[PDB]
Amino acid sequence: VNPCCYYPCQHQGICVRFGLDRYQCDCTRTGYSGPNCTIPEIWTWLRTTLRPSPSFIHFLLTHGRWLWDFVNATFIRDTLMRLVLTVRSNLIPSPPTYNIAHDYISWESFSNVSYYTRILPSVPRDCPTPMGTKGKKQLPDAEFLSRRFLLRRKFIPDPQGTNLMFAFFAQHFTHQFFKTSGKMGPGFTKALGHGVDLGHIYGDNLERQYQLRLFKDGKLKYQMLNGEVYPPSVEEAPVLMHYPRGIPPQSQMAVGQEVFGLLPGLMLYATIWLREHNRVCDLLKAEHPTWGDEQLFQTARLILIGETIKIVIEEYVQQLSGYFLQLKFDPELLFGAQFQYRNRIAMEFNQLYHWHPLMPDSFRVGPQDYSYEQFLFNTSMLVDYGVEALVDAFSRQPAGRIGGGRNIDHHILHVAVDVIKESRVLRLQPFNEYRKRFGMKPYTSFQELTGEKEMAAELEELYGDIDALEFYPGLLLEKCHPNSIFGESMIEMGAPFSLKGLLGNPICSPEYWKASTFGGEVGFNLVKTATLKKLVCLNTKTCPYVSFHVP
Amino acid sequence: VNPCCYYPCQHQGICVRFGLDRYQCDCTRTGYSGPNCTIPEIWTWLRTTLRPSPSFIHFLLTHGRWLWDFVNATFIRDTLMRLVLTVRSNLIPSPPTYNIAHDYISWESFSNVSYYTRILPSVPRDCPTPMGTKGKKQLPDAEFLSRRFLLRRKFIPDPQGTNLMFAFFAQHFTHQFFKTSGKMGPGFTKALGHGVDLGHIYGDNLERQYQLRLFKDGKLKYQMLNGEVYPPSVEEAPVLMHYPRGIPPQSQMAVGQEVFGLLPGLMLYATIWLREHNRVCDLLKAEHPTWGDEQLFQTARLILIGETIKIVIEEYVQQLSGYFLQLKFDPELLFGAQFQYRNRIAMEFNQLYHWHPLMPDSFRVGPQDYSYEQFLFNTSMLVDYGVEALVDAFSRQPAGRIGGGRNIDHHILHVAVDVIKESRVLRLQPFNEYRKRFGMKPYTSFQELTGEKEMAAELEELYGDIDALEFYPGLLLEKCHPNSIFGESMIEMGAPFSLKGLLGNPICSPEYWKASTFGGEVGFNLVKTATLKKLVCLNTKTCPYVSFHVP
Numbered sequence A, B: 001v002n003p004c005c006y007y008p009c010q011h012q013g014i015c016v017r018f019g020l021d022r023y024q025c026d027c028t029r030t031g032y033s034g035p036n037c038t039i040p041e042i043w044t045w046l047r048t049t050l051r052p053s054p055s056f057i058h059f060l061l062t063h064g065r066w067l068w069d070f071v072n073a074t075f076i077r078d079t080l081m082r083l084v085l086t087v088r089s090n091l092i093p094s095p096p097t098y099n100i101a102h103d104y105i106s107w108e109s110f111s112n113v114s115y116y117t118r119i120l121p122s123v124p125r126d127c128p129t130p131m132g133t134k135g136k137k138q139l140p141d142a143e144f145l146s147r148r149f150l151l152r153r154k155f156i157p158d159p160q161g162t163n164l165m166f167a168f169f170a171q172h173f174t175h176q177f178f179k180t181s182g183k184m185g186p187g188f189t190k191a192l193g194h195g196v197d198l199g200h201i202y203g204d205n206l207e208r209q210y211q212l213r214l215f216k217d218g219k220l221k222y223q224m225l226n227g228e229v230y231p232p233s234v235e236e237a238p239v240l241m242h243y244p245r246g247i248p249p250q251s252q253m254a255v256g257q258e259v260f261g262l263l264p265g266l267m268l269y270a271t272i273w274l275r276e277h278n279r280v281c282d283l284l285k286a287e288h289p290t291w292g293d294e295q296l297f298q299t300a301r302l303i304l305i306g307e308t309i310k311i312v313i314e315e316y317v318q319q320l321s322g323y324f325l326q327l328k329f330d331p332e333l334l335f336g337a338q339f340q341y342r343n344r345i346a347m348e349f350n351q352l353y354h355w356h357p358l359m360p361d362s363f364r365v366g367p368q369d370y371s372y373e374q375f376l377f378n379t380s381m382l383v384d385y386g387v388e389a390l391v392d393a394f395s396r397q398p399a400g401r402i403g404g405g406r407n408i409d410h411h412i413l414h415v416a417v418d419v420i421k422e423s424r425v426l427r428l429q430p431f432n433e434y435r436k437r438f439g440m441k442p443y444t445s446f447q448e449l450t451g452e453k454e455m456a457a458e459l460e461e462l463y464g465d466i467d468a469l470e471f472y473p474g475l476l477l478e479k480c481h482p483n484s485i486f487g488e489s490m491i492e493m494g495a496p497f498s499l500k501g502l503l504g505n506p507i508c509s510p511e512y513w514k515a516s517t518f519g520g521e522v523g524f525n526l527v528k529t530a531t532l533k534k535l536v537c538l539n540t541k542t543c544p545y546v547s548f549h550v551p
């Protein structure tokens, strides 16, 4: 039996098989010694014995508004902000390690970027069970598993007050790096940027960019409807889009992210960001009359990437975390650390970001309450209503609790079923293993995972061992932090993926974080001072209620 | 007139144009303040006032064998070795900056790797002269310039004792990252690895790899001739090669670097390294009976990359530098520094590596003395003679002095003419500017550059201003260090390009420099203990004189 199936090596040691039987754990720089990397070093032991519970830390970061307000106003902010950054980022490896194709480091894994990387090698195809050593020889029927525990019965709204504006933002945003290759199979991605390259705006390939490009003042092609700016028509800018057959080019918006074409929510943001890139071009042109198209274009894109990363950290992540510490985007807090300004999308991080439970039961656009059947492909709602309008709406309606269970609207429940299946193809290791890998202690019972006894009892008969509970179901079915949108593992496993993928962008490097990179103090400030509100409102005839938090 | 043409911004400040006229220098983190980044900071001034002449340093590193021997045996070795590494690496920017297409940072420059990057933006196409502000309005006719100063009259051998074994090594080696795209124009490269990916052995693209692959024990296809191993035939492994029309597949060796097909020197090494990869596979298979093709293949490639980087630093660079300090390859000397494990090939670094003057007047293979006319495409010399034989030969014959002037054999003189021309297309800035950029003070006269008065006088009438002397000619025509293969600028500008491109490989990162990456302590040591001699001799029936230094 493959010894590595027993996941022998601890604390990130590497299981290497030898001989027919045998295996050896590589505990290089692990912090532990021993045959399974279990015997700590004085400092390592001392370090972990004092490491305060993730739960505790969370508690602190969410209480004492008063105390925190003071802190946010002292230097201690940056101090912490930096600390968070560093310690968080360390769990994610760089350079990348393994891929769907290699549970080893190989030059090809490091070079071929069509692959999504992974943090934990697959459960060896020669293990006795589909999870390794424990559990049933067959896993719960996803359809069922999804219908029994992820299927929304009564809408549970997210307590943080996360509204639709955030739900759509998160969607649209994450759809620039999660873009699994259809024809290539799972574990392959079309987004070769692996990060925030704003490729869903400019196109995932050069040709497609040139298509959406106006080639005048560095602008992106667009069109006027009701004397307002929207993306161009597929007719105008002949790019490939995904619209149900029967919808004509003249009625399709060309945009950069083929899929975005079906959900006014997506196209809404796609219009704001287009509008923005065009506006920035005009600014640049003022300062640089001597500038050319590309120079302008290229520079604008650099600025937006800046805007995007700021809004994402200070407004988005703030909301999602509910922390009282005011997060801050300042790539200089890292100029002292040993950070690698590079990022590669993890298949695990893709699963984890399947926050479908945010989606509501019905989409209320004022007195009007639309159905999925009226939302899902409506090629007119955007133009009809207008940016400002829809923004106000989405800003007001709440999105559902993410973690917790049974909160995924049936219209998109299939997605989650597919996620489970896909996971298995990827031979993803067990939830409990990942619990460890990301600093946590594994669950000892289904009753501990979920906060209750009922479904914890069924999962038990279903899976057979907490040590066999899968990644995604484990993430979605774990008990939620007091009044949080989700629980411990979501944060403890997601945050590193998130923060490494945000600071590890070439523009956060000391090399590019020069004001010249952005066209001067002008462009630079745009980056240094972005706001979700400024984003919408400067590109709309009238500023509505804009916020990730429902009023 | 474009103000940036005057190269106003000092010490790496960035010239940004503004308004029709105007310009502003971005001295962010430059070390200087001021309108042109000229007013130092106390520490910066203090730092440069003590910075000992590069010449001095060189002197020290080349005398006192006695004193050095002691030092090489103390910890002080590592100490220095590390220092060299860090301080050297800093001149090369990471992430990369500009490209043939953009004299600005642009996401596209950071993403599109078909581009060779550059350290210094081009001389703006709107400047009054082809070099900016100084010099003639037309540059010296390359053909002439090459015939008057680079054309060998009497062979000057390199004093360091560099032989042909080194000349060919350097050639073959550098032909894995210098691989300019024919159909794409200058400034475009086919080697998307930008470093030591050993792509000239395994192929520059996946398909081509699979072609040269045997798919058994992780081996590379090969063939037997005289009961000895050589690469396979183009017939056997149908890969694309470059052989004059009329040479049949059955008579062509398939190898990985299409061009290598024409020069027994290249194919000689290509055979050694193939032989090696196959041998390592056998080792791996012993330890890992349970291993598969890919696992074996992939792992072997990782080990060779290791071997290659060791031989390159400790034997190759040692010889080429003539230092008494014993250089050392230990990626851990960097685990403390803030280094970025990534590398991108500089167009400037490509020019600089055009060491054609190494090539002899005639190739002596024992009593036999062959002509270029008998060497240049001889599809049999290798098989005829045998690895061991040719190795001994090349190890004994000396190669010419690189720097100095008039030492390029006429058979390949065209190459240098083309280099000059190509430079101009790239609109490469002036030698003197690069002198500064890499820490040096610019030459004040042609007589100072060259050690003499004669040709210094002609270059003067030719160029018109030392401030107009071009990159390559300036490198090749500058006065050689006492008994060195070349002068100051070659080392001061080449070493950083070299050392950053050697340590900035993902395997030198603390993430991959685990013994598990190489299949265990076995593979690991292969890397940790490589020798040019071990390389040849373990793959040959008999060990000959092998060395980069002529006996």
Ligand code: HEM
Pocket (backbone or CB within 6 Å): A167, A168, A170, A171, A172, A174, A178, A179, A180, A181, A263, A350, A353, A354, A355, A356, A358, A359, A412, A414, A415, A416, A418, A419
């Ligand atoms: C009207 C609402 C939405 C619909 C109809 C929807 C549907 C889908 C579908 C069908 C897929 C493809 C996999 C499959 O075949 O099941 C997908 C993938 C995914 N969705 Fe959504 N989704 C919605 C909202 C969201 C939101 C709000 C987010 C952001 C949390 C999100 C995150 C993801 C992610 C990250 C993937 C993976 C994409 C990839 O790897 O290519 N989705 N979604």
Ligand code: HEM
Pocket (backbone or CB within 6 Å): B167, B168, B170, B171, B172, B174, B178, B179, B180, B181, B263, B350, B353, B354, B355, B356, B358, B359, B412, B414, B415, B416, B418, B419
């Ligand atoms: C029999 C000896 C050699 C011949 C016939 C030769 C010839 C050439 C030729 C023709 C090119 C293409 C450019 C052109 O059209 O002129 C080339 C490029 C170059 N050679 Fe050689 N060379 C020889 C030895 C060397 C050696 C010893 C080195 C190593 C120092 C070297 C380094 C280079 C470099 C780096 C390039 C640029 C390649 C690229 O960018 O694609 N060559 N050589």
Ligand SMILES: *[C@@H]1O[C@H](CO)[C@@H](O[C@@H]2O[C@H](CO)[C@@H](O)[C@H](O)[C@H]2NC(C)=O)[C@H](O)[C@H]1NC(C)=O
Pocket (backbone or CB within 6 Å): A101, A112, A113, A114, A115, A183, A184, A185, B205, B206, B207
């Ligand atoms: C990246 O890796 C994938 C898988 O190794 C490569 O895709 C396959 O490549 C082989 C050889 O060309 C083909 O037989 C397959 O049909 C390819 N497609 C898929 C979906 O597997 C891909 O070519 C690699 N890309 C690079 C640039 O190396």
Ligand SMILES: *[C@@H]1O[C@H](CO)[C@@H](O[C@@H]2O[C@H](CO)[C@@H](O)[C@H](O)[C@H]2NC(C)=O)[C@H](O)[C@H]1NC(C)=O
Pocket (backbone or CB within 6 Å): A206, A207, B101, B112, B113, B114, B115, B183, B184, B185
């Ligand atoms: C890398 O950059 C080069 C130049 O920008 C791209 O090559 C050109 O791309 C355009 C659009 O496809 C074509 O019109 C040219 O014919 C292409 N070839 C050359 C030699 O310029 C190249 O496509 C880019 N590669 C990527 C992956 O972005």
Ligand SMILES: CCCCCCCCO[C@@H]1O[C@H](CO)[C@@H](O)[C@H](O)[C@H]1O
Pocket (backbone or CB within 6 Å): A051, A052, A053, A054, A057, A060, A061, A080, A083, A084, A087, A088, A089, A091, A438, A439, A440, A492
């Ligand atoms: C108020 C104190 C702020 C400290 C900020 C540290 C950021 C959170 O750090 C996280 O802590 C977890 C629990 O120790 C670990 O498991 C994670 O690896 C780590 O990223």
Ligand SMILES: CCCCCCCCO[C@@H]1O[C@H](CO)[C@@H](O)[C@H](O)[C@H]1O
Pocket (backbone or CB within 6 Å): B051, B052, B053, B054, B057, B060, B061, B080, B083, B084, B087, B088, B089, B091, B438, B439, B440, B492
């Ligand atoms: C015996 C002393 C060894 C010192 C090793 C330092 C490595 C050489 O360092 C070089 O020195 C040059 C001159 O100062 C600078 O111009 C270069 O930028 C730097 O890389």
Ligand SMILES: *[C@@H]1O[C@H](CO)[C@@H](O)[C@H](O)[C@H]1NC(C)=O
Pocket (backbone or CB within 6 Å): A006, A007, A008, A009, A035, A036, A038
């Ligand atoms: C190492 O791990 C294996 C598998 O979990 C176990 O059987 C073995 O006893 C462990 N050895 C030690 C010393 O912990």
Ligand SMILES: *[C@@H]1O[C@H](CO)[C@@H](O)[C@H](O)[C@H]1NC(C)=O
Pocket (backbone or CB within 6 Å): A373, A374, A375, A378, A379, A380, A381, A382, A384, A385
């Ligand atoms: C599309 O939405 C509009 C409002 O924007 C609504 O009037 C119309 O009926 C919808 N069409 C469909 C097919 O749902």
Ligand SMILES: *[C@@H]1O[C@H](CO)[C@@H](O)[C@H](O)[C@H]1NC(C)=O
Pocket (backbone or CB within 6 Å): B006, B007, B008, B009, B035, B036, B038
């Ligand atoms: C800045 O540089 C320009 C161009 O070399 C020069 O004309 C100008 O006088 C300089 N200004 C200062 C203060 O050095």
Ligand SMILES: *[C@@H]1O[C@H](CO)[C@@H](O)[C@H](O)[C@H]1NC(C)=O
Pocket (backbone or CB within 6 Å): B373, B374, B375, B378, B379, B380, B381, B382, B384, B385
């Ligand atoms: C090729 O080299 C061999 C020796 O290896 C020599 O005998 C033969 O004449 C050469 N052929 C050519 C065309 O130079």
Ligand SMILES: O=C(O)c1ccccc1O
Pocket (backbone or CB within 6 Å): A084, A088, A317, A320, A321, A491, A494, A495, A498, A499
């Ligand atoms: O810093 C965090 O804890 C965090 C948590 C969730 C999402 C983003 C984050 O930065």
Ligand SMILES: O=C(O)c1ccccc1O
Pocket (backbone or CB within 6 Å): B084, B088, B317, B320, B321, B491, B494, B495, B498, B499
């Ligand atoms: O360290 C150096 O000075 C050096 C010089 C030339 C070539 C390689 C090198 O490492």
